[PDB]
Design a protein around this ligand. Structure first.
Ligand SMILES: [Ca+2]
Ligand SMILES: [Ca+2]
Ligand SMILES: [Zn+2]
Ligand SMILES: [Zn+2]
Ligand SMILES: [Zn+2]
Ligand SMILES: [Zn+2]
Ligand SMILES: [Zn+2]
Ligand SMILES: [Zn+2]
Lengths: 251, 251, 251, 251, 251, 251
């Protein structure tokens, strides 16, 4: 019902993901019909706000695909809002220290242990108190993933990996390749060797490892490493690419 | 500037089209970047209204691709609205007689010759009277296409083809195959032979012939017949198909 | 998955309904959490269009409650639109002859038997062709209800009740009491005696009978008569009434 | 509080009007702060639907300016929708016979006298039944204006003017000049003499005469003739003209 | 006309409030027709942004109910935006020090005394400079309420209560009970005794005390203590509860 | 095609600007038809969010007028969003140190030199990777303006003017006159003398100077000083003023 199946499957299987940046309920529903294990509603790099993410959670809710929401940043009030509209799995960009990851764990948990604002009567998260024990049980079905995607993030990796309540570390190859001076070129061996080592350290610390690659060969290679959550394409890239390919057959 | 290049090119070249049923400005802009000769904003089979079609005309306006709007039906007031938001080419579904096609010609022209409501001060069509002689020159850049896609439409084809101000007849293979008792199966020889004969009669009467086929082989065959406007795919079908194909490489 | 359970339950049980006139995907979701057998998305008397009805179908789709859509009128093109966004049950207002009810049956069925426009590729109804045999099986799961709520409707009742493909006749007590010279007073014995006789005639002809009443005693009495689909309240009335009642405890 | 002051002032004073075609609640509020006697929300020549018109009724409702809504056509179901969202004055375009004007009167009145669909519980018009006697009193505060703006309209002027419940006849100079073969040149003596005689006949039959002119000299001449409701400008034309004039001071 | 009646009544009477988290202009208008002294537009726990809050200010503005806006956090730029759209009373969540309360006072006042960004020409607050002296008089009609709802808030209660320009302290029972280790159980004696003492200290320092309770007995007890602004219910909770109660009469 | 002409013209000519605070794609299009060198889409003082700014970039993109976006504040994540939707010129309000101006430069540039988040695949800025070398060439076409409009801004003026990558300093006369104790009276000689000296210092340090004034005489005087970018009016002010002026001709 509101069991976080993406959260349970981190320990259980490898989950194939689709990036959703078309930023509307109608597009999110089309993606939701395909059968991806997870759909990333991108609040960071697509023109989304709280209301458009809600619309996309409502579309996707009818379908087995599990929703993961990336906020624009690790903003504690915005995390409060996204949890209340019922986003059960968050991906926080650009996480750079154990202290920042601990703030994000606290942002996802109610007082007295955390700092998640309490407003269950008003929340789709509680179905407006129609889930009777929401305030006692919400935490069990919240999944927190953080992105390592900067030099400082790699510099604090072991420390982030010992933070209790971080379920998964996701590697951002676009941000990380740029930070490493290989902007636009994550396929470089220098970047790939750091990514592979990063995945191994994530899985050796008992956390789930995730990544995005539209490159089919790199995606399969990440899956052979045991990477637990692999996004394998992007709705905007697939729409543009297929329309271009179709046109080139007639130019 | 507001020259209807789709209209001029009916006499000049074969125009490759993309069907736009994602029904928002953002999606219409992605399609507009590909380089299709024309984009069909579907008011009949996608969840569009006047305001969403406006948003999509505004997105597309920055790009060389020419916009064609299909209204839900040959409704004279709705044609008035779509012309005022600045749609220069309309495709009218389910046209079934010379009398209906003549009503549609009149719907696209100002009195005293036509019945297009006059409200140029308020219209994006006139850029709010920033096009000085709009009321004298609008008609020159309006293009009217009608669909033949029923038994009655085929029964009135010669009569529709002698109506002055019909620039083009578009064949709807989904509606026509269903009307012919081959619903879901336009690829049948019975349907194809009627389509090919219909195209030849359209071009022999000096009008532009158009059609949609997502089948690449049928599309190329329609282009070899000299069909002037051929839509060759559908944004919703390309997004769904590419996301499915991508997923099957990992299932 | 896309089985019309409301349609099946017409022969099987009494279905308790809630009127949805708050005209937004968020309000439709709240209503969908209660457990009503059916939700009437009101496109006649609430400020809805095709796009707002789509948002409310997507909200409701995640919940067992079955959606029924009332269009503003028996308009064939608008029926086409509502079917393509995936409304499986329609309630047509102000139906007044067998001829009009037969037009509505045809409006819900594909050619060659009906006049439903074919555009399955673009439709949420087909899940963008992800339901493989949609064009062959669509009609099995479409349910057509018609409203008798005028003197001319009652004058054509036996004729409407012999129209094959009318699944149900719903009585509109507001429109009907007004047509009978008892505007705002459907509780009058003159009106109630016609309502009861009408329900009996509907069930004697083997069709489902429906009605709305916010009066609990009248709703229970219609349920004791065997009325198959009974709406029992209206979201706007319940929001307003409960807010007034609460304020009167403090004035 | 829901007294139709525009309707009362038709017998009492000359009411100065502003055309609103910017088609959003924010623009309609700006216009509402100026102090016009009336504001014409234009559903015919501005990109409005029922929901955009509702938003503009809500903006305007805090201000003394009275709202008048022009629907796209004399469509009975659309009239029903506009009345239910709480539009108390309607301006019907392109009215051409006593029969059509009588249909419009009926479209604004409840059965048994009229054909206005009854659904007061759901309507902003009744404030969701918070106006207790709404169904008994609604018609007293409904004002029906019809546009005469075609040859056929002028050919049926005396017949339209004897139709009980037509409160006002509005002359459309753009449509009328077009219909008379002077498209874009309403200023012509041929057109002006017909407008003047038309106004005198409207007032001799004891109905309110209305018109729009953005020409100040023509507006004042129509006011000296006793024209009861004169729109004197258009928000889109004032926005465009003021921005152009400002720029020419710097080119 | 733009007099902040909520602000004046803080010294004068006890004001009864309704929480508005249905987050659209249509729902806010329904609530506005009931006669609550105030309406809390909830930007913290309902899916609102600046534009949705503007729509709800516009709906409510026609009605005597006074609007109060809760922003998501004490963010100075967001406060600037909410003031400019014309919100005259703000409820700042989670205020924890005299320093933070002083920052919020400054955020509501123009330089040189405050840090409210100046842009009156563009603002609904000034009615686009149609309120002539707006920049000189704005602060007289701005009301600042701060929430005490954490241990740190209670630890800084005396300091917050000596901050000039804090008009009211609102107690958040959900956040406060959570912070005290009684999450979801504000009814506990431990929590109630802290709330009662907190209210008495707020009123002894000559500020207005406020609270929300949906429990009628607790609401009336807070009113007997002299609490100046008591919210007594939540629109989402009333909608859900009334629809559930109605359904259980038929299960 | 995506050349920043506003940026090039900073070294080349004086650019006449219009302030856009009507906050919608339709109004932004009207303004885009006039021929202003630049249009300021105001995300600080008009009710805009990322999605409404996107709609207005898409409207404006078809016209030669160059778009400049003011965010609500110098927020690094919000700058990321506005750059990804394809805003090429940003005006940062209330910049007060070289440290803050350097943060803003970094916020507009990709790593490793800056901290702009990398997500080109999803961005209108890259046209969804249809601009092939976007990640290599993006910064060449990004223009950063900062506002000096506080005492601390003037106290850090020389330091801000030595920050490499600040293309322009814009003076905010409303915020600055208020900070100087002359709120609502920027026309005072004390204020004007600081504005003139500030412009001279900006141009002496080889940066572009900008300002807004709706006062024609002050705008011409700033143009005679060589001010590179001068906004000369505000859409809301021009809509309101022209509507009031028109009404005063009839009162
Ligand atoms: Ca709409
Ligand atoms: Ca928004
Ligand atoms: Zn990243
Ligand atoms: Zn068709
Ligand atoms: Zn009815
Ligand atoms: Zn007209
Ligand atoms: Zn709280
Ligand atoms: Zn400023």
């Amino acid at each position: 019902n509101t069991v976080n199946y993406f959260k349970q499957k981190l320990k259980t299987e490898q989950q194939i993901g689709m990036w959703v940046g078309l930023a509307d309920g109608y597009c999110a529903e089309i993606a939701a019909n395909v059968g991806y294990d997870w759909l990333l509603i991108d609040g960071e790099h697509a023109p989304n706000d709280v209301r458009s993410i809600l619309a996309q959670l409502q579309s996707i809710a009818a379908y087995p695909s599990q929703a993961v929401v990336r906020p624009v940043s690790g903003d504690v009030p915005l995390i409060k809002q996204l949890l209340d509209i019922g986003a059960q799995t968050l991906l926080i960009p650009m996480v750079e220290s154990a202290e920042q990851a601990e703030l994000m764990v606290k942002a996802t948990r109610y007082p007295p242990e955390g700092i998640r604002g309490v407003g269950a009567a008003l929340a789709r998260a509680s179905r407006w108190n129609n889930i009777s024990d929401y305030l006692q049980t919400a935490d069990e079905q919240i999944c927190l993933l953080v992105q390592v995607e900067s030099k400082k993030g790699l510099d604090n990796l072991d420390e982030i990996l010992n933070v209790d309540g971080v379920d998964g570390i996701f590697i951002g190859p676009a941000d990380l390749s740029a930070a490493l001076g290989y902007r636009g070129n994550p396929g470089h061996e220098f970047v790939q060797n750091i990514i592979v080592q990063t995945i191994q350290k994530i899985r050796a610390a008992g956390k789930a490892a995730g990544i995005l690659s539209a490159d089919e060969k790199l995606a399969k290679q990440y899956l052979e490493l045991g990477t637990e959550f692999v996004a394998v394409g992007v709705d905007t890239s697939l729409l543009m690419k297929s329309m271009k390919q179709l046109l080139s057959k007639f130019k």
